[PDB]
Amino acid sequence: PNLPPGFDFTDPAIYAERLPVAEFAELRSAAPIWWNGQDPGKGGGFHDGGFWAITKLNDVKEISRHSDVFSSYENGVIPRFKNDIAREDIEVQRFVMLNMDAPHHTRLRKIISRGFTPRAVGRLHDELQERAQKIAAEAAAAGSGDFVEQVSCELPLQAIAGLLGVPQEDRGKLFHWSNEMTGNEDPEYAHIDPKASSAELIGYAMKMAEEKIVTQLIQADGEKLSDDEFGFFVVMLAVAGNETTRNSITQGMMAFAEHPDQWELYKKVRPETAADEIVRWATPVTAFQRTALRDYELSGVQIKKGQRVVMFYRSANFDEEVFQDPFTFNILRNPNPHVGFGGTGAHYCIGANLARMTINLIFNAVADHMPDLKPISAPERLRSGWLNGIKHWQVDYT
Ligand code: HEM
Ligand SMILES: Clc1ccc(CO[C@H](Cc2c[nH]cn2)c2ccc(Cl)cc2Cl)cc1
């Protein structure tokens, strides 16, 4: 592949500036499964010398289906942390369902599914609709400002808060904790600890369960979450459903600003197909990883026991062999077999429909209250080597 020497698809330095679209496309053409070597002290907390970069949609899907071979437990699924992270701080992330394997995963996913039935998510619809409309109304009123803060941030948080029945009086502190919890190495957030906020939120979660969806989860059925499991559940959601859906909203609106015909069409018909195009295009989670528990031949590459594989959803979502005109934003996209919510398999995003609803509700409200919104200045990107984040985006709502 024509890539610079020692180029690392997980390098936070890249994502601080841009998405490496041209580099991904190069791999898809020249080396769709490619060993991304990492020098010592530069593996983002991993010290195994590198990982297999997975760039093709079907390979991402194959990995995600074969979780009997490709493990989330062994090194967790987050492929990049601060280079100096202690291993202990990686391993502790095995206490969330995301970073478990069968049979422990199966049991927790089965219980936590109580929270995510279409009926449970459907019940949140009206309050989130009301919240979305008021958010949009308040941003329109303010004239201009930070679209991330004023429009993208709060609804995903309210969706988490509503699913859990957090009292309104407690939502402020909950959101504060949640917003310090998804680790990054960005200089704007250098003074934030993850650790303290996580401890403090698990403390609240376990007090909440003590005082008591929360009911369904901690009530015996005789499967129930233990109080610490409920805590681990809440801490997981604070990361899983926060900056993920936020960046779908930010970058979907960015897509609309760049594709004014799509925005015009959206405002008329709010089509059913928009949310999934927004997710495909935003690809909030750039990459998650797995560790091979045995040797596995994947598209002619001999993957070895113990090696990491990094599924770059940002590549797979633009796979030219699958998506017609992948680099066209098409809100009527059909079909749309994207992996923005993961490959289908044991770990496929449990919050996918909760995210779609959040997305439709906010964009309906934006179309309603700020139909002529225009950016004032460039998005500011988050320094993360797995999260595709926009910290700030100054826009003129009128
Ligand atoms: C547009 C927004 C979202 C995106 C792009 C996204 C992305 C993903 C992806 C790629 C995975 C796969 C995990 C893996 O295969 O290793 C996942 C899993 C997960 N997501 Fe989402 N997600 C979003 C919204 C949400 C929301 C709103 C929630 C809940 C409030 C949620 C909860 C979860 C949970 C609990 C898992 C782990 C499932 C398991 O391990 O069994 N997600 N998400
Ligand atoms: Cl007191 C606590 C509570 C919870 C965890 C679980 O550890 C990490 C973050 C993390 C914090 N401190 C060290 N590591 C974590 C991983 C994945 C997700 Cl999706 C969410 C979270 Cl919060 C650890 C300690």
Curated annotation (Swiss-Prot):
It comes from the Bacteria. One of its GO terms (biological process) is cholesterol catabolic process. Keywords: Cholesterol metabolism, Heme, Iron, Lipid degradation, Lipid metabolism, Metal-binding, Monooxygenase, NAD, Oxidoreductase, Steroid metabolism, Sterol metabolism, Virulence. It catalyses: cholest-4-en-3-one + 6 reduced [2Fe-2S]-[ferredoxin] + 3 O2 + 5 H(+) = (25S)-3-oxocholest-4-en-26-oate + 6 oxidized [2Fe-2S]-[ferredoxin] + 4 H2O; (25R)-3-oxocholest-4-en-26-ol + 2 reduced [2Fe-2S]-[ferredoxin] + O2 + 2 H(+) = (25R)-3-oxocholest-4-en-26-al + 2 oxidized [2Fe-2S]-[ferredoxin] + 2 H2O; (25R)-3-oxocholest-4-en-26-al + 2 reduced [2Fe-2S]-[ferredoxin] + O2 + H(+) = (25R)-3-oxocholest-4-en-26-oate + 2 oxidized [2Fe-2S]-[ferredoxin] + H2O; cholest-4-en-3-one + 2 reduced [2Fe-2S]-[ferredoxin] + O2 + 2 H(+) = (25S)-3-oxocholest-4-en-26-ol + 2 oxidized [2Fe-2S]-[ferredoxin] + H2O. Involved in the utilization of cholesterol as the sole carbon and energy source by degrading the side chain during infection. Primarily catalyzes the sequential oxidation of the terminal methyl of cholest-4-en-3-one into (25S)-26-hydroxycholest-4-en-3-one (alcohol), (25S)-26-oxocholest-4-en-3-one (aldehyde), to finally yield the carboxylic acid (25S)-3-oxocholest-4-en-26-oate. Also able to sequentially oxidize cholesterol itself, not only cholest-4-en-3-one. Substrate binds at residue 183. GO terms for molecular function: cholest-4-en-3-one 26-monooxygenase activity; heme binding; iron ion binding; steroid hydroxylase activity. Induction: By cholesterol. SUPFAM superfamilies: Cytochrome P450. Belongs to the cytochrome P450 family. InterPro entries: Cyt_P450, Cyt_P450_B, Cyt_P450_sf. Pfam families: p450. Its cofactor is heme. The keyword Oxidoreductase applies. Disruption phenotype: Cells lacking this gene appear to metabolize cholesterol normally, probably due to the ability of Cyp142 to compensate for loss of Cyp125. Pathway: Steroid metabolism; cholesterol degradation. It comes from Mycobacterium tuberculosis (strain ATCC 25618 / H37Rv). The lineage of its organism: Bacteria, Bacillati, Actinomycetota, Actinomycetes, Mycobacteriales. This is Steroid C26-monooxygenase. Heme binds at residue 349. Its EC number is 1.14.15.29.
